[PDB]
């Protein structure tokens, strides 16, 4: 079973925990010389690069939000709004 | 190192305001009249004389009435020591008669020629107890 892309009830805004987790994961990837999907423009710090990569929505990750009943809603990072 | 306790049963309001005592490794608590009669002081009044040092104090004696009512069953020394022994056939008396010498108030004497000392002292403890119970 799953939950359809329509009728998703969770917050369209990215939580700070989701943000920290995504930035952390992406920084973990960059720290092991993984391809960068944005222009460095002088940046060398993996976390900073992950932040700039987040601002441009160039992070190919997806958040699986778990409801207490066991259900789950999938929200791509590109779709989630970052207002923090 | 022995610890003697004199308990006043029945709080303020209760009718069964009896006074008992705890003797070294003896099963249940013993009424004070039984203790006094086990020490040689048999009749009433003389016990009260050992407790209440003022015959004018009618309140204290009034408080001592149910104690007399309690120990009315035992009317002699032999049956008093027999009572304590039953707690703890005649051997029990010799058991009892030992506890009142070696264990009951050892700080005065552990001899055998002293019974009035411990009796008067016990009466003193009763006096203090009742003085505290009468809010004096």
């Amino acid at each position: 079973k799953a939950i359809p892309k329509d009728q998703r009830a969770t917050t369209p805004y990215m939580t700070k925990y989701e943000r920290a987790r995504i930035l952390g994961t992406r920084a973990l990837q960059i720290s092991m010389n993984a391809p960068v999907f944005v222009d460095l423009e002088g940046e060398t710090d993996p976390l900073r690069i992950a932040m700039k990569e987040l601002a441009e929505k160039k992070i190919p990750l997806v958040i699986r939000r778990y409801l207490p009943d066991g259900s789950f809603e999938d929200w791509s990072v590109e779709e989630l709004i970052v207002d923090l | 190192i022995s610890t003697l306790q004199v308990k006043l049963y029945g709080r303020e309001g209760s009718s069964a305001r009896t006074i008992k005592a705890t003797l070294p490794y003896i099963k249940q608590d013993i009424p004070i009249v039984i203790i006094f009669r086990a020490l040689g002081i048999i009749p009433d009044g003389e016990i009260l004389e050992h407790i209440c040092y003022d015959v004018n104090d009618w309140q204290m004696l009034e408080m001592l009435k149910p104690c007399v009512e309690d120990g009315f069953v035992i009317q002699d020394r032999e049956t008093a020591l027999d009572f304590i022994g039953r707690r703890g056939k005649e051997k029990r008396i010799q058991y009892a008669k030992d506890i009142l010498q070696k264990e009951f108030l050892p700080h005065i004497t552990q001899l055998e020629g002293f019974e009035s000392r411990k009796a008067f002292f016990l009466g003193y403890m009763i006096n203090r107890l009742l003085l505290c119970a009468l809010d004096r």
Partner: protein, 213 residues
């Protein structure tokens, strides 16, 4: 002396009973509830002065508005007993009364206490329910108190809807005691969820839910 106090207390108890029954979803006019003590004395008290308690016992009918939500809800029968220490003797009469009259809810309002030999046959006549109430426990309506929010007994469809929308299980709901004075006031059976609507210093309105067990 004691007469006026008994009459007044029984009167307030009667008013509270009417409020309760009309809160359960039965037809009771507001004018009937607000029955003055003068009228009460001139309708229930004898010319001698003795308060005829059995003269008060009446029946109540579910409103169409209540039939819409709860169709299975039948007529209710309020009974004010005269005997103080009610034993099994009057209990048999009351039980057989509800049995023959064929009602769904019987309110037994005693003035002192009930023998355990009489409460032994109270929950034994399905589907009808017999509820015991002390007169002194109904002198003041507890639901009128400040700290007591309004409880709304909802249907089985409403309950299933609640369980579905929050995707819950019955064990995951907040619980309310069956012997809880509010649950007793509404006459809640086990499994019946109530919607508790309380005021909030942070939102204004807040709706909690409590399943009965």
């Amino acid at each position: 002396q004691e007469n006026e106090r008994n009459i007044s207390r029984l009167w307030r108890a009667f008013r509270t009973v009417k409020e309760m029954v009309k809160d359960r979803g039965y037809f009771i006019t507001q004018e009937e509830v607000e029955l003055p003590l003068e009228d009460f004395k001139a309708k229930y008290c004898d010319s001698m002065g003795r308060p005829q308690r059995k003269m008060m016992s009446f029946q109540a009918n579910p409103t169409e508005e209540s039939i819409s939500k709860f169709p299975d809800m039948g007529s209710l029968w309020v009974e004010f007993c005269d005997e103080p220490s009610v034993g099994v003797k009057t209990m048999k009469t009351f039980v057989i009364h509800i049995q023959e009259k064929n009602f769904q809810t019987g309110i037994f309002v005693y003035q002192n206490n009930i023998t355990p030999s009489a409460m032994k046959l109270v929950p034994s006549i399905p589907p009808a329910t017999i509820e015991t109430f002390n007169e002194a426990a109904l002198v003041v309506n507890i639901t009128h108190h400040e700290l007591v929010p309004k409880h709304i007994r909802l249907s089985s469809d409403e309950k299933r809807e609640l369980l579905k929308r929050y995707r819950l299980k019955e064990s995951q709901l907040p619980r309310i005691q069956r012997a809880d004075p509010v649950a007793l006031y509404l006459g809640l059976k086990r499994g019946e969820v109530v919607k508790i609507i309380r005021k909030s210093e942070t939102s204004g309105r807040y709706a909690s839910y409590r399943i009965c067990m």
